[PDB]
Amino acid sequence: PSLLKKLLLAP
Amino acid sequence: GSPESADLRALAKHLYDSYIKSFPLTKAKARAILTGKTTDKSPFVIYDMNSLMMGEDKIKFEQSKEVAIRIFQGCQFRSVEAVQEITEYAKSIPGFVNLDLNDQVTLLKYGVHEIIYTMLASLMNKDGVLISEGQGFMTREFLKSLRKPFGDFMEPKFEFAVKFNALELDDSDLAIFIAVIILSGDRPGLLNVKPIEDIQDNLLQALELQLKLNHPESSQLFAKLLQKMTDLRQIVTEHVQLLQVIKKTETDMSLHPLLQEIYKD
Ligand SMILES: CCCCCCC[C@H](OCC(=O)O)c1ccc(Cl)cc1
Ligand SMILES: CCCCCCC[C@H](OCC(=O)O)c1ccc(Cl)cc1
């Protein structure tokens, strides 16, 4: 569960 | 040779353009506001409790919690905004989005605060800090006056900023400096260090050429900036130590979920 990963994956 | 050099200047320009897209308030705009050279509306100055109450509506990013804690909470949301901007910037660095995704997370987790403190310096002079994208200015003495230990958080950042700002870097220099820091191959738990250092090596060459061209009279500026990178890691270490104190001393502090991820150690 990573908020950083979600930020990184949003174009 | 000259072909490599031209590529380094194109990389520097790409980073600058991406930096302008990622960060709403640049150093050039911040310094204009600080030196009073802007035509835009003056920041509301917060220097004491009365002015904080009055200025509160000017600087907003209800409230019965004590003031030091209220400033503490507000700072997290500003920090979370900075993380989001820095992540957008990182995704613009050539090669970054092709890295292993867990390594991208690691680079941001361990690098974002060093970038926050670098960019915070742009908003600072020896007397205070520009807040709310230039809509407020909170004095260094006011922040120092907050009840112990809350008055201890910002002062080391001011101390760093005054020395860092004496180097007179501009936004073009800063864009490359922060990219170098993000692409640090020594962060804990990186899975594939070589592609990160390959990117960083190219960024370091771009930074050195940028400083030689943009600051031809500033002897060993590049070496000074490598040392500032080390200094920023010390600021982070000290900030974490202060957070541990608050966690042990203060009763019920809500830590934002994004900062919880970053500070999970
Ligand atoms: C733990 C450090 C103290 C909290 C940092 C405040 C964040 C600051 O925000 C100013 C504002 O919005 O008032 C800021 C800094 C860098 C970037 Cl890139 C963006 C924003
Ligand atoms: C007192 C006046 C200066 C505020 C000091 C900076 C605050 C700090 O910064 C956020 C960050 O480390 O990203 C922080 C950490 C956790 C919580 Cl719950 C709140 C604030």
Numbering used by the authors:
A (entry chain B): 141 to 151
B (entry chain A): 204 to 264, 272 to 475
Tell me, in the authors' exact words, what the paper reports:
We have also determined the co-crystal structure of the PPARγ ligand-binding domain (LBD) in complex with two molecules of (S)-VSP-77, which reveal a previously undisclosed allosteric binding mode. We designed VSP-77 based on the binding mode of DA to PPARγ LBD, with an oxygen atom replacing the β-carbon and a chlorophenyl moiety attached to the γ-position of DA. Indeed, we found one (S)-VSP-77 molecule in the ligand binding pocket at the position as we expected. The carboxyl group of this compound binds to PPARγ in the same mode as that of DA, forming a hydrogen bond network with the side chains of S289 of helix 3, H323 of helix 4, H449 of helix 10 and Y473 of the AF2 helix of the receptor. The phenyl part of the chlorophenyl moiety forms Van-der-Waals interactions with residues F282 of helix 3, L453 of helix 10, L469 and Y473 of AF2, M463 and L465 on the loop between helix 10 and AF2 helix, and the backbone of Q286 of helix 3, of the receptor. The chlorine atom of this chlorophenyl moiety points to the loop preceding the AF2 helix and forms polar interactions with the carbonyl group of S464 of this loop, and the side chain of Q286 of helix 3. To our surprise, we found a second (S)-VSP-77 molecule in the PPARγ ligand binding pocket, filling the upper portion of the pocket, which was unoccupied in either the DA- or Rosi-bound PPARγ LBD structure. The chlorophenyl moiety of the ligand is in a highly hydrophobic region in the upper portion of the pocket, which was unoccupied in the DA- and Rosi-bound structures. It is surrounded by helices 3 and 7 and the loop connecting helices 1 and 2, forming hydrophobic interactions with residues F226 on the loop following helix 1, A292 and I296 of helix 3, and I325, I 326 and M329 of helix 7 of the receptor LBD. It forms a salt bridge with R228 of helix 3, whose side chain is flipped about 180 degree from its positions in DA- and Rosi-bound receptor to facilitate a close interaction with the carboxyl group of (S)-VSP-77.
Peroxisome proliferator-activated receptor γ (PPARγ) is a key regulator of glucose homeostasis and lipid metabolism, and an important target for the development of modern anti-diabetic drugs. PPARγ is a master regulator of adipose cell differentiation and development that belongs to the nuclear hormone receptor superfamily. PPARγ is also the target receptor for the TZD class of anti-diabetic drugs, which act as PPARγ full agonists via an activation function 2 (AF-2)-mediated “lock” mechanism. SPARγMs stabilize the AF-2 helix in distinct states between closed and open conformations, which allows AF-2 to more selectively recruit co-activators, which is associated with reduced side effects relative to TZD compounds.
